[PDB]
Amino acid sequence: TTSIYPPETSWEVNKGMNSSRLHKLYSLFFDKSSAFYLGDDVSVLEDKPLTGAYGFQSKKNDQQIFLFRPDSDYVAGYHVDAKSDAGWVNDKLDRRLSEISEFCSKATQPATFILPFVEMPTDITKGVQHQVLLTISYDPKSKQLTPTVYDSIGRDTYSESLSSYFKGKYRTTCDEILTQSIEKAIKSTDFTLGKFTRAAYNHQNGNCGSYTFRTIKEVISSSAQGTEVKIPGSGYITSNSYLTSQHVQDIESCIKYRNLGVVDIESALTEGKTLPVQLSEFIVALEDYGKLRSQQSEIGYSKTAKLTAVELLIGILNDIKGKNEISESQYDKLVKEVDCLMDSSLGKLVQFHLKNLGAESLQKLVLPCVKFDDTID
Amino acid sequence: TTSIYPPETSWEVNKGMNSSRLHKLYSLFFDKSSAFYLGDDVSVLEDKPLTGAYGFQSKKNDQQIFLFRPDSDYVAGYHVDAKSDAGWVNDKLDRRLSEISEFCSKATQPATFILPFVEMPTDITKGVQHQVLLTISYDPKSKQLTPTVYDSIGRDTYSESLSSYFKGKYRTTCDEILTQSIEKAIKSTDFTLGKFTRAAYNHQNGNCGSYTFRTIKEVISSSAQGTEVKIPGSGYITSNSYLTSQHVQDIESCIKYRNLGVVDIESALTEGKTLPVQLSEFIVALEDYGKLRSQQSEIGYSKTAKLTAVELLIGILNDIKGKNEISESQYDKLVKEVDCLMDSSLGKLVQFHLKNLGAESLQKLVLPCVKFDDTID
Ligand SMILES: [Ba+2]
Ligand SMILES: [Ba+2]
Ligand SMILES: [Ba+2]
Ligand SMILES: [Ba+2]
């Protein structure tokens, strides 16, 4: 168990997802600068905790929404070979299903449970893991609950499609073992099991993670009321309108440039709070850029140039955090390095932080806190 | 512990290396069709086993060569931040170093120990692991032994180079902790420690694995006698001449198309044997192609077309293995699918296997074993 979610500079959406990153992204849900912001609901009065998840009262409804914090251990393996057994669900995931069942056994209000999880083939050697989303909606008056999976990799086109017969020899997904796990989680045969369905969308053939996150937003908002809206018809025209570029830079800037504790997040979705960006984060980001840039592995600006720049910027940033102040000479030295710190990736980092610090530039940011006298060097 | 090394179709060199694959590649060392073939030496008379490694008497020398079977656990982590401590070496790797030291404490003949291992930064979040190679050469009359590391990622160019000063703030490699582990492995202060050196070659910035394998070959052959020959001067002109395309298709075809037990390998380097390709392998390869092709994830031929083809080919291949025979009708059905089974990747697979089965084509391969009568459908 590790408790911080560092800035991963040089991370991009095509570089794939994991439980920690996804959880970090959760912080966006209450940030109004963000297109993932839910002003569609509020938190659940401090009761009914349902461990592992964050609760939400609908502002527009009597409907309650429980979104699970992601887990390295929510995983479903499936056997692609169909002579083999359908698969396994990880005993924690199974556990959470049993727990939903038990939350619903006593529930006076309609609920929706949103669990993100990883779906993988275990026969083959690739072991592509794709980020994927389960939601279970329960109605008390209807005495029943309906499973659904939202799958981003839902490409396949007729040429690459599978015949009814060959489907018999080959599993492309974990639906068999998963439905099994669910009808196992409820049996007093207490509940009617609504039909299991799977929502696929356009042509992915590892961006799955980010679509999953977007879908969580869509799934929550759409539950204040309204049908579920995803790409391939019954929704958005294109994948690009659905997950917009403003959704993307939001996600990327979050992962790429921020340093967030898990406590900070937990508080943030418990109290319906936004997490503003501390200056300490700017410093950590710079440091990580710094470490990564110095690497050799997987009047233009050089490595030692970039590094001296980061060193100096870091220094100044600290002396600002230090009570204290900046000195004239230091301001000059920064000015010489400004055009370098605004260059490329490092620039994007810096612009992110200046934007969220309420400063137009490095000079503007740094200009107060400077002590002057007379003529200085 | 898993004991087979399946064919990974769709694997390519740019897709990176691991302990099992690398070990599988070891099988090429005695195959004369292969450019990795050592007709430069023979095995060690069955004595002096030095557990974990394979021994070799030099045909041209009194020199002994011990190449280690790779391990998921031979790993060196290093801290890129230099205010931090240099790193860690995995207690197994350390263990093997202590064991070399002890083999050399009693040794009457000059030896060279070749250990492949993975080198990684632990501060940063990427955790790029790059396949890398240690060799330790001991002389009894010189009372001493010399460490060397061969590093393929040895790119960096002056712009992306690191100043003497910034080297002080940043580690790009595991040399510090590694040299430490070595001078720790010998202290009675019994041995003189030859100077630790590191051989880098051209411009990689994850092919590292395959270069490492090539280097093992170079390191072994070059030890029958001769200086060590790698790319950046003191060797081959270009990386492409060093690791030739004939080296590459050898490696790829090995990983991609073969099914090899670890027992088969162990025997093969113990007895100096070649492993010819069983027909069973062809069948396994086809099956794996089959599984992977049916997947949706990370008059032209369709998925269901390709699959029916594989199904039929597999069927026929089995009936061949089954004592038994093929039937006329079956031969026809194959003929209809021939142009499909020769297409693209599947084709490359099939051509690999036909080449190593002593058959010009599918029809030629399958043509005996067919029973005829009169006019058949
Ligand atoms: Ba289970
Ligand atoms: Ba039923
Ligand atoms: Ba150790
Ligand atoms: Ba010394």
Numbering used by the authors:
A (entry chain A), B (entry chain A): 47 to 251, 256 to 348, 355 to 433
What did the study's authors say about this model?
L. pneumophila inhibits autophagy by injecting an effector protein called RavZ into the cytoplasm. RavZ functions as a cysteine protease and irreversibly deconjugates mammalian Atg8s from PE to inhibit autophagosome formation. Unlike Atg4 that cleaves the amide bond between terminal glycine and PE, RavZ cleaves the amide bond before glycine. As a consequence, the RavZ-cleaved Atg8 proteins cannot be relipidated, leading to inhibition of autophagy.
Next, we solved the structures of two RavZ fragments, 1–487 and 20–502. Crystal structures of the fragments are essentially identical, solved in space group I422. RavZ structures of both fragments are resolved from residues 47 to 433 and 48 to 432, respectively, whereas the missing regions at the N- and C-termini (residues 1–47 and 433–502) might be flexible and disordered. RavZ shows two major domains, the N-terminal catalytic domain (residues 49–320, catalytic triad: C258, H176, D197) and the C-terminal domain (329-423). In line with the crystal structure, RavZ1–331 showed similar LC3-binding affinity and catalytic efficiency to the wild-type RavZ, suggesting the catalytic domain is sufficient for deconjugation of LC3-PE. The C-terminal domain has been recently shown to be involved in association with phosphatidylinositol 3-phsphate (PI3P) and be essential for membrane binding. Structural alignment indicated that part of the N-terminal catalytic domain of RavZ (α2–α4, β6–β9) shows a similar fold to that of the core-lipid-binding domain of Sec14, consisting of 5 β-strands and 4 α-helices (α7–α10). Similarly in RavZ, helices α2 (corresponding to α7 of Sec14) and α4 (corresponding to α8 of Sec14) along β sheets form a large hydrophobic interface. However, the hydrophobic pocket is closed in RavZ, suggesting that a conformational change may be required to accommodate the fatty acid chains. It should be noted that the LBS of RavZ is closed without showing a binding pocket for lipid, whereas a clear hydrophobic binding cavity that can accommodate fatty acid chains is observed in free Sec14 structures.
